[PDB]
Design a protein around this nucleic acid. Structure first.
Lengths: 32, 65, 155, 115
RNA sequence: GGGAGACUGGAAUUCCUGGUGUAGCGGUGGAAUGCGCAGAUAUCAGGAGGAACACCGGUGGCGAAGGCGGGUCUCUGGGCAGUAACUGACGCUGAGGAGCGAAAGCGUGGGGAGCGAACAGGAUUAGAUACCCUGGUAGUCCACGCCGUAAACGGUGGGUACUAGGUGUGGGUUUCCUUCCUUGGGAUCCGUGCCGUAGCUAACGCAUUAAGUACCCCGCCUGGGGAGUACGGCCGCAAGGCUAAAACUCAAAGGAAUUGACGGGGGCCCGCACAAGCGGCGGAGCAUGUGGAUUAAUUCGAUGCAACGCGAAGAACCUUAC
């Protein structure tokens, strides 16, 4: 295969983990 | 790769006390000689190796000059 | 170059002295197409070596043939990434040049006016083999044996 | 003092070169490095620098009367044969050449690689 | 070198102690930060502690996969070959389910030599939250638990039967000559590689270790983004893992190979391109031409090699365009 498909999916993965980190404390609040 | 003497009906028994037999297959500096040059088989190289190694530990051969 | 050259001009035997070894120098020391004036000096420079020492110019051939004989020196290369030196066998053309650069070409600086009596004086000193020019021959001698055991490359 | 026989320890890395002349036991009687010669910076590793350091260290050792020296080299520096040949030029009349470089039996972890 | 427990060996790095010993050491494309001058680096002797095991060692061995090599003892799993003694289809696959599962990460308790995410300075740079350098904490290590994911790749599910061979290599059996050793050759069983027919493939290529010819059972796929995301649920101390959509939007996203172009990719070969040799420029004075400028104009061009005694092979007026 080609690596473009992998770094296309990698960016969505990398961006999403950042979103969970930033909203880590807020998620534990509305999760009550 | 001339032949494996040890691997001879007419071949000695490898012991960790026969310092003499081992000198033949260790270098000038402890190195255990390879099998490409020595020529021995796989099974018996494995022997010389465990021998040279045990010997060195009972202080009968240099851990490397 | 890339294939191998040839010796183009021939070392013609001298007309009056019959030695291509002299022919080596009369053309080695030279000027702007001045083989006329070069004829004047090259016979007017061993002229004192004929009379001031008293020995004939054939003897002038003999003394300067054997007095200044570097004949083997060293040379640089890329080896060592530095100025590593290895001895090399050299034709005596680079040997008389070692003295020519301090010869009658450079003998002006000593307080020696009266044109060619000084240029005869230097080639007189060239016969001597202990004069001014042989210092570089000695300088490269001590340099060659400074890296005495540097010939194992042997180019 | 007065010791006729001694040992020379040359350590030559990619950055420097250290020469110390010692008694047969190991006590240092004269040491000189490339930085003590006068070089400073990237020039310590050059073959020229090692040649001068051996020349200087040998000169100090001759002042204490050493006549013959036994040489042990150690390190991957370029100035190893140059350090030896300089000891010959000073006239220390070296003995036997040896080589003692510490190679581990896969012991400690080497540092991170360079990019 | 299949696995678990216990004991144990030395070479090196670090640190401590004591000699010898002065002025540097370290680092890089170059440096500085840093360590020293209170005795560093170097060097000899003694000691402390932790981690990994040069040579053997490889396109070799073992394990279902992950993975597994310093030595010895104890306990234990699997495999192959030979004899056909034994039961007599007891086989194969296997939805859910259960166990094992590199590394990082989490908890409680030890340990910490080197290396070192984060963190400090030093440097490069227009800027350095980087590459480079000097330091450095969790971690890397051990005991008991948890996590359950990787390019966890041969990117190739398991079983079975058949279909030209040649050459290597690792185990176990045996006929033809015998020295009576074994790389003597011969045949057969089981691994592991390279090449190569029939055949297959879009092509690359696979090719008795099939991606060929057939049968049985399981998993999975149905255009690209949104998205392996949200919502609901299960598991988890936490990090998060598993099952898994829709609105909207695009007319493509893709796999293989050909030809050019390009590379701060490689090889080879030529040229006064270097090396051999001679003479100059660069230092002085003056001629020319450009730039910087002052000015009323100091006409218009040319600008790197491939502009600069160039459009000029003729500016006292004309030339001349200011």
């Amino acid at each position: 295969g080609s690596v473009i498909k992998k770094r296309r999916k990698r960016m969505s993965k990398k961006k999403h983990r950042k979103l969970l980190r930033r909203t880590r404390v807020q998620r534990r609040k509305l999760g009550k | 790769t001339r032949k494996c003497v040890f691997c001879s009906k007419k071949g000695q028994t490898i012991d960790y006390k026969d310092t003499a037999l081992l000198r033949t297959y260790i270098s000038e500096r402890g190195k255990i000689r390879a099998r490409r040059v020595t020529g021995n088989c796989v099974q018996h190289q494995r022997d010389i190796a465990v021998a040279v190694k045990n010997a060195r530990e009972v202080a009968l051969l240099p851990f490397g000059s | 170059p890339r294939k191998g050259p040839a010796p183009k001009r021939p070392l013609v035997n001298d007309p009056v002295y019959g030695s291509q070894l002299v022919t080596q120098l009369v053309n080695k020391v030279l000027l702007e197409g001045k083989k006329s004036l070069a004829e004047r000096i090259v016979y007017g420079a061993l002229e004192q070596a004929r009379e001031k020492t008293g020995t004939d110019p054939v003897v002038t051939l003999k003394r300067a043939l054997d007095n200044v004989k570097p004949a083997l020196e060293v040379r640089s290369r890329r080896v060592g990434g530095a100025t590593y030196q290895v001895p090399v066998e050299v034709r005596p053309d680079r040997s008389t040049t070692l003295a020519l650069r301090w010869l009658v070409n450079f003998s002006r600086q000593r307080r020696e006016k009266t044109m060619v009596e000084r240029l005869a004086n230097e080639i007189l000193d060239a016969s001597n083999g202990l004069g001014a020019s042989v210092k570089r021959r000695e300088d490269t001698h001590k340099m060659a044996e400074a890296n005495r055991a540097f010939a194992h490359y042997r180019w | 003092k007065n010791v006729p026989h001694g040992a020379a320890h040359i350590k030559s890395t990619f950055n420097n070169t250290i020469v110390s002349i010692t008694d047969p036991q190991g006590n240092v009687i004269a040491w000189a490095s490339s930085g003590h010669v006068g070089f400073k910076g990237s020039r310590k590793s050059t073959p020229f620098a090692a040649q001068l350091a051996a020349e200087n260290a040998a000169r100090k050792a001759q002042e204490h009367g050493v006549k013959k020296v036994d040489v042990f080299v150690k390190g991957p520096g370029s100035g190893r044969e140059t350090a030896i040949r300089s000891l010959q030029a000073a006239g220390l009349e070296v003995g036997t050449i040896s080589d003692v470089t510490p190679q581990p039996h896969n012991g400690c972890r080497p540092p991170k690689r360079r990019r």
